[PDB]
Design a binder for this molecule. Sequence first.
Ligand code: MNR
Lengths: 216, 218, 341, 343
Amino acid sequence: AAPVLSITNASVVYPDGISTVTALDSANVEIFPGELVAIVGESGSGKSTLLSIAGFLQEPTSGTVTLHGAEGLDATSTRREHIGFVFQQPNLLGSLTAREQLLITDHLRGIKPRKDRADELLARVGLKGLGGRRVAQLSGGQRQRVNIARALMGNPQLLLADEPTSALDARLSKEIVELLRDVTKEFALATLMVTHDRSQLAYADRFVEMADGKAL
Amino acid sequence: AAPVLSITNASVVYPDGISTVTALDSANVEIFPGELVAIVGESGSGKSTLLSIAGFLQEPTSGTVTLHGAEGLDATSTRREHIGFVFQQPNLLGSLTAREQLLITDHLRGIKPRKDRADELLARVGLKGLGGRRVAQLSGGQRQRVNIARALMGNPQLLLADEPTSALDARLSKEIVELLRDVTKEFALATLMVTHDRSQLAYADRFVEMADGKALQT
Amino acid sequence: MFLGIRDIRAAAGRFALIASVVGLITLLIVMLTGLTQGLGKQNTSAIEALAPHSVVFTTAGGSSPEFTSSEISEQQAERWKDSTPLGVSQTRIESDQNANTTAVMGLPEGTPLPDSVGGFIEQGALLPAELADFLHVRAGDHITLGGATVTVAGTVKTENYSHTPVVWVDTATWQLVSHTKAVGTVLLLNQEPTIQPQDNEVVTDLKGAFQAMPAYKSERSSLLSMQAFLYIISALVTVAFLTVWTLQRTRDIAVLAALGASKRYLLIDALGQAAIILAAGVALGAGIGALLGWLIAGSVPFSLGWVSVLGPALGIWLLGLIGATIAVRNVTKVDPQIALG
Amino acid sequence: MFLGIRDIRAAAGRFALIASVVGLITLLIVMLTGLTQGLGKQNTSAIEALAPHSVVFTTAGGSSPEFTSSEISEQQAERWKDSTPLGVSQTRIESDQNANTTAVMGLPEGTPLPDSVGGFIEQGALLPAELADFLHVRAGDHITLGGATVTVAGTVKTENYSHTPVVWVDTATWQLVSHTKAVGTVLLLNQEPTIQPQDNEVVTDLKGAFQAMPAYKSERSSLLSMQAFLYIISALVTVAFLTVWTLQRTRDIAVLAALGASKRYLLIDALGQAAIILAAGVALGAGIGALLGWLIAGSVPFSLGWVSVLGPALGIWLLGLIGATIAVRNVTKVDPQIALGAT
Ligand code: MNR
C-alpha cells in the first residue's frame, strides 16, 4: 500500500564529448514491495541511465527521484542503507572470498560482520558451503549468484539488476531470473531489472519499454 | 566463390572456474568478400566466442579456422596484416589524437605512418577535419567512427565488428551500420558483425542465428 | 580498512618490492644517523663533557675563532675572574713499546674532571685506559709526549677531540708539550660572563665552540644535508608509488563507492593499507639498521641509541603518512558510475 | 615506440614525480662520488705526488703499519740502499700575525720534489702559497713551527695529508720540529725491493701505504658503502615503480596486441618510454649535481671531472635499463582478449 521508489518526470543530460546528449527523457516509474519490474529496449535507449538514476548513482538534471524511508539522506548514504546492486559484471573484489564479498558490505556499513548470515544467503543462492571459494574457484553463474547474495546482505528494499544475465547462456540466465524473482517475492523486495532478452519478461510482474530515452 | 574466412566445426572450451565450459560447439561459418554477415543471438549464445575465434585472438579447442591469403602465419601476424577490429568498446588509446589512432597501426606494421590515408579514411567515416581531436573531445558515435577508420587503415580483408552500436541511440546506430555496410561494399571487405539489435539484419547480406554456442542452420 | 588489509594478504609480492625500497632508505638513514652522531661525538665529546657555559677564544685579523690558532695569555686568564684556561693541542705520544698521535688537553692542577672522564687533573699526564694498554704502559711509566718526557699519573676514560682521544695534563705540563708561553688555548666559563670582552676576544656558546673546531662543522653539515635528501627521497618515493598504486584500485574502490561506502571509509581504507606497508618497511630497515650498526660500531664511529634509531624511523614513517594522504586524496573523487561499466 | 613517447607528452605529471626521484638519487650519488674522491686526495695527494714504487714501514708488536707510529733509524736507512727518507708529521704553525695547524713532510736535503710539487728540498721550510697568504708571512720572515723558529724558504703548490696542506722541509729540520733522532717516518723507494726485511719491518705498495694513514681507509670505505646502497636503492626504486606502472598500461598494451603488434614492438615501446624517462631524470639530476659541486668545491673538498660525474650517471642509467626489462617483462605476456571485453 506504499511504493518504495518513485521517479517523477526525470531527465539526464550528459556532456557527450564536445556537445550534450539527452540520455533519459521524462522518465516516470514507480515500484512497490514484491514487484519485479523489467525495463526492455535496445542497447542505448536509456535503460542503464534510468537504472543509475534509480540507484542514486547520479541525480537527474531535472525531475525528482524519491526513495521513501530514505528521505533526508544524501545519495551515497541512500545506496548504503536501502539499495542492493546486481551489476552487469559480478564486480567481485579480487582479493576476497565468496563469503567475504558479502561481509565487506557489513563492514562498510559499520557493523560486526555476520558470518552465519553470509553463509545462509550464499546457500539461499545455491552456493551453500562455498563461502570459502575465491573468485578463481567460481564459475560465471556462481559469481553472478554471489553478486545477488551480496545485494541481499544489507537487506535492502530496492534491488537493481543491470542485465545480470548478459554473460550467461540460456540455462544459466533462466536460473538467475528465477532466483531474482523468487527472492523479490520472498523478501518483499521492489526490483528493477534492466534486460534485453525479452524471453525474461515472462518472469517479471511488469515491464517498461524504452526508446530514445523516452519510456512508453 | 572463394571465402576470405572459413570457420569449420570450431569449438572452444574455457576453464569456467573449477569446471570447464564449451563456449562454442562445432560452429561452421564462411564469409566471402563483399558480404556483411550478421550473427544474431542473445547475450551468452556464443557470438563473441565465434568472433574471437574469427579474429585469431584465440585458437579453438577443436576444429580449424582459416584465413585465405595469409596461410602459414602465427596468430598475431594474421591480425596485424589481414584483419580489422571494430571492438565493442571503441578502444581508443588515450594519449593519441584521432588521426594518431590510425597512424599508430601504420607504425606497428613497420611503415612510416601515412597521414594522407589517415585523413582520407577519417573523412570517409564522416570525421573530416577532426583528426586533431583528442578522445575527451569525441562523443560516443565519433569514437566508434574513429574505430571503424582505424580498422580500415591496414586495408584488411576481414573486418570484424563486435556490436559496434551497443551504446548508441537508434538514430546513431543506423548511421554506424550504414557506414559498416557501405565501407564493406565499397572496399569489398568480408565483414562479420556480431549484433544483438535485430533491427540491423536488413543491412546484412546474410545472418546466422545462434543459441548456446551452436550456429543454427537449415 | 577491510578490503585494504586483505589486498595486502593476497598480493604480498607487489608490496614486498616497495616495502624493501622503503626499508633500504630507512636502513641507510638509520645508519647515516648513527654515523653522524658518532662522528659528532668523535669531534666534541671532550668539550661537551666539560660542559662550559661560554668559551672565550683568541683571533687574528678579526676572523672567526679556530681551536687551531687560539691562545690565552696569563693576563687574559686573570681578566676573566672565576674561570680556568683550557689548553687543547694534538701531538705524538711515544712509549717504549709503541707510539701514536693523540689530543692533549691541559687544565690547572686540581680541577675536577667530568664524570664522563672522572678523576681530577694531576701533576703529569693522565692517559686514556685504551691508549695506555696500546702502549703497554702502566701508571708511573715515562712517556714521550710532544717531544718531552712526562710521567703517567694514571689511567682514565676516553673523550675525543678531532678524532683523537684526550690525554689530560696539568696546565704546566701542557705548556711543555705544546711549546707555548700561554696558559691555554681557550677559556672555559661555566657561569654567564659578567665582563665585556676585548677586541681580540670573542665569547661563544657550547655549540659555537664546536664550529671553531676545524673538521667538525664542515663534515657534520655535509652529513646533515645528505640526511635531508634521504628523508625527502623517502617521501617522494612513497608518493610516487602510492599515486600510481591507488590509481590501480579505482575499480574496486568504485564498486565500494557504488555499494554505498562513504568517502571517509575509502580514504581510511587506502591510508590504512599504506600505513601498514610503510610501517613494515621502516621497521625492517631500522631493525636491520640497529643490528648492522651495532655490528659495525667497533670499526667505525657509530652512536646507537633508541632516539637515534626510532627518531629517524618515526620521522620517515610520518613523512610517508603525509605523502600517502597526498597520494590517496583521489579515492574520494572516484565516480561510482565506474562500477556499472 | 609510438605510443610510449606520446604517453609522456600527454601525461607529463606522473612522470615528473618519478623522474624527480631518479634525479634526486643521482644528485645525491653524483656529489657523494665527487666528495669521496676529493677526500681521498685530501688524505693522499701529497704521497701520490712523490710517486714511490714500494714503501718500507716500521711496526711494533707486528701490528698494521701506521704513519702515526713509524720512525726509521739512520742505520736502518743504510741497510736498504737506493732509498729516500720521508718524515711525516702534523704540528702547529704560528706566524707573527696568525697561526694554524698543518702537516710537515721532510726529505733529505737537495732532493728535487716531484713535478706535481716541483722545486727542491732546501734547508728550512717550503710553504704552500695559500697558507703564507693566510699567515701574512713573506719570503724571509721567521715563523714558529711546532715550537721551532725556521725561515720561510719559499712558496710551492699545495698537496694534502690528512686534511692538512704539506709543508716541505729538509730531513734535519723536520727532526727539530718533530723532536726525534730518527731520519724520517717512512722510506720512499723508486726501485724493486731487493733487501730482505726484518720481523719488525714491512714493505707496502702505494695503495697499501694509504692504509697506514689513519683517516683514509675507515672513511673512504664508509663513503663507498653508502654509494653502493644508493645504487641499489636506485635500481629497486625503478623496478618497484615500473612494475606497478606497466601494470597500469595493460589495457592499452592489450589493444595494441589485439590490433596485431608484435611482442618486440610492445617491449621496445615500453622500454623506450622507460629509457627516455630514466635518461631525463639522470641528466637533470646530474646536471644540478655537477653545478652544486663546482659551486661548493671552494668551501668543501669536492673533486669534479667528467668521469666522476658521467661515469656514475651512466652506471645508474644502465642499472635502470636492466631493472626496467625486469619490470616490463610482462608486456609480452598480455592476452589480447582483454580488448574484446571490459576492464
Ligand atoms: C673538512 C673536513 C671534513 C669533511 C667535510 C669530512 C667529510 C666526511 C663525510 C661526509 C659525507 C663522511 C661520511 C666522513 C667520514 C669519516 N671521516 Mn671525514 N667524513 N674526517 C675529517 C675531516 C672531514 N671529513 C678528519 C680531520 C678526519 C680524521 C683525521 C685523522 O685522524 O687522520 C676524518 C675522518 C673520518 C672517519 C674516520 C673515523 C675513525 O676512523 O674513527 C670517517 C668514518
